[PDB]
Amino acid sequence: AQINVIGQNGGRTIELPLPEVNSGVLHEVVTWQLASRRRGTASTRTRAQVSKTGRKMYGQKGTGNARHGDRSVPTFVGGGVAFGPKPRSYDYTLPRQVRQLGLAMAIASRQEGGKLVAVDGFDIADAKTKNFISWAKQNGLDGTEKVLLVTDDENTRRAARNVSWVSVLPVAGVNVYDILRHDRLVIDAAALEIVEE
Amino acid sequence: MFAIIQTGGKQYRVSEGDVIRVESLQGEAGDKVELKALFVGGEQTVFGEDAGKYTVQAEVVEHGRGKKIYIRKYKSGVQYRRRTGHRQNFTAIKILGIQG
Amino acid sequence: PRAKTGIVRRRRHKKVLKRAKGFWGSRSKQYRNAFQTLLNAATYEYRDRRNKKRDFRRLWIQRINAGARLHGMNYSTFINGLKRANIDLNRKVLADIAAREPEAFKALVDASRNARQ
RNA sequence: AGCGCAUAGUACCGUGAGGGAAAGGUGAAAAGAACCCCGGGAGGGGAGUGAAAGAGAACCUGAAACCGUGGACUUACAAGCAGUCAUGGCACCUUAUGCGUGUUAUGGCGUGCCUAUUGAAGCAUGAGCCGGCGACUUAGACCUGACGUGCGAGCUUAAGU
RNA sequence: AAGCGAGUUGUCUGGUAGGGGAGCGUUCAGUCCGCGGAGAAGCCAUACCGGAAGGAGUGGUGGAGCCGACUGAAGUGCGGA
């Protein structure tokens, strides 16, 4: 059993229980991603006297219902509104348990997703990205999906940055941030593969 | 020669004048089916006696589909606060109908 | 954040301005005598197609009262003549029909008139 | 709108330190325009310019109280701010189908909304209109509690890599 | 694979402080194969449907984009202070 390319062809390692499906209790890893990594700023308004001006006023009780006495209300056009969005630094922790399995749950029915074992490229020489990526044609992988990327090299794993095409950021480990992004999940590094470690 | 009668309610003159009707539970959805029971009105050629022996012979009507609906929103309320609203889900078939 | 609804609140006023009927002056594009006159068109308008029976009720109680008095007639103290046939039941609408054939009470007079003894 | 400044905190308010505007936008590009008219000129003609000049030399599209005219229809002898329906009444027939569209003498009668009010329909008050602002929320192991989930022996701060 | 009811009987009352509960849509963000030159988005009007709010049929005009379903966020909505 088990399909593969570049190297050999086999498989029996597993870990990760994964019954039928019933997955998706990882939505708090869809805002934490932008909380343990996010720049709050807003329009910035909470000050009740950002204006900083004089005091006293006209005849608060005369003429035509003054309703004066300085300017401390969100009425006069040209100021703020008092109280509101202050910088904020995003304070959430996200349970540290569900992570090395919640990911496995993202393989519930995503199992169909392409996955295997490999090492960059063997039918090539050094590095120059051309017919190396073009090798990804021995399976229709050059304009049919999205391609997941991981590897363990940082010397030849940076030559594919686009706006709508592929993504790339590697650290040689796992990341929910990139587990559906590229439809066929393909880690494989012979250095930091599916290891539960 | 003309037509009056009951069922559903009373809103007639039609003998071929074509007017929208009401509905029925089961037995709908399908061009024509025919339905009848007893009668009440008649007139006829100077012979509309009552609504008692308004049976005897039967006169087979038609029954169309269900005809869209005069959709609206509704609104009411006086000096306070604003709430409520509940659509008219009526069907209103057509029923060709034909004298007998 | 942000919204700027300095254009969306147009169709709102109009979605109700549907009733820009012949009111007064120019109460069809007013912006006063519209969303107010609408609140005026917001009364028994709700029940202005049912309660109306009371209005058209003021019809058959002049005709059904005593039309062809050349018989006997009474209507009121005669309704006990109506529901005195085999299967009377029905009543109005058939009054609206009574506006057609005058022979709606020929042999339908003394066929309830003395239908007592 | 956003700091008041998207080239002004101009002029200034003024008794004094001290308070201040409002305001942006033509298309890529002005090519922001010779040539006869009324007229003092402003403003308006021809005609190129203009891919497109119902952009238009105080200029995108351009909704609106007020405001500009006519027209199919009704109206001063009929009475109530307004109403909805109600037979008629002139018009139209984006499907002859005695069926409707733009409507009115008149009839039942019928008194507004907001909204602090026991309480009204009020003369109880708020309201000429247009355009926006339109508020119990934001950080806080501040706490209790519904649901989904983590576990039954349970859950983590400070940042160090 | 997120729960749903005809068949039927009483309740389905009207509701002011309130309880459980559905949404129309705009701005921010996901996936954008996308939708638009016959030109959409800006807007003006036509009797389909919707529990109301509103979603629909087409031109008009207008000039370059714009929103969608599953989703969370936002100074989310009185003409009326």
User: In chain E, which nucleotides are within 7 Å of a protein Cβ?
Assistant: 7, 15-17, 25-28, 32-33, 42-55, 72, 74-79, 81
Tell me which residue in B10, B50, B53 faces C93 most closely, judged by beta carbons.
B10
Is A132 within 8 Å of A160 (Cβ atoms)?
no
Give the ranges where A8-58 is alpha helix by DSSP (H).
none
Long-range contacts of B46-55 (CB under 8 A, 24+ apart): B46/C101, B46/C103, B48/B4, B48/C101, B48/C104, B49/C107, B49/C108, B50/C85, B50/C86, B50/C87, B50/C108, B51/C87, B51/C88, B51/C89, B51/C90, B51/C94, B52/C85, B52/C86, B52/C87, B52/C88, B53/C86, B54/B5
- Decide if C85 contacts B50 (C-beta within 8 A): yes
Domain boundaries along the sequence of chain C: 1-117
CA distance B13 to B17: 8
Sign of CA dihedral C35, C37, C38, C40: positive
Question: Which of residues 21 through 80 in chain B touch C, CB cutoff 8 A?
Answer: 40-41, 43, 46, 48-53, 74-77
Q: How far is C43 from chain B (nearest CA, A)?
A: 7
C1 touches chain A (CB under 8 A): yes
**DSSP H or E segment with residue C81:** helix C79-82
Which chains does A contact via 3+ CB–CB distances below 8 A?
C
Residue of B7, B38, B43 to mutate for C, most C C-beta atoms under 10 A? B43
**How many Å from the N-terminal Cα to the C-terminal Cα in chain A?**
25
Query: Measured between alpha carbons, how far is A183 from A166 in angstroms, rounded to an integer?
Result: 11
Alpha-carbon distances of A128 from A131, A155, A156, B49, B89, rounded to whole Å = 9, 11, 8, 105, 69
The partner residue sitting opposite C90, judged by closest CB among B12, B46, B51, is B51
Interface contact B11-C42, CB threshold 8 A: no
If we measure between CA atoms, which residue out of A124, A159, A149 comes closest to residue A138? A124
Q: What is the DSSP letter of A63?
A: T
Q: How many other C-beta atoms can be found within 10 angstroms of the C-beta atom of residue A131?
A: 11
- Asked if C38 contacts C19 with a C-beta cutoff of 8 angstroms, the reply is yes
Q: What tokens does A21 get? A: 């499906």
Domains held by chain B: number: 1
Final resolution, Å: 11.5
Chain B environment of C42 (Cβ under 8 Å): 75-77
Rounded Cα distance between C95 and C45, Å, is 27
Cβ–Cβ contact A84 with C under 8 A:
no
C5 in Cβ contact with C11 (< 8 Å): no
Residue range of the domain that includes B74: 5-98
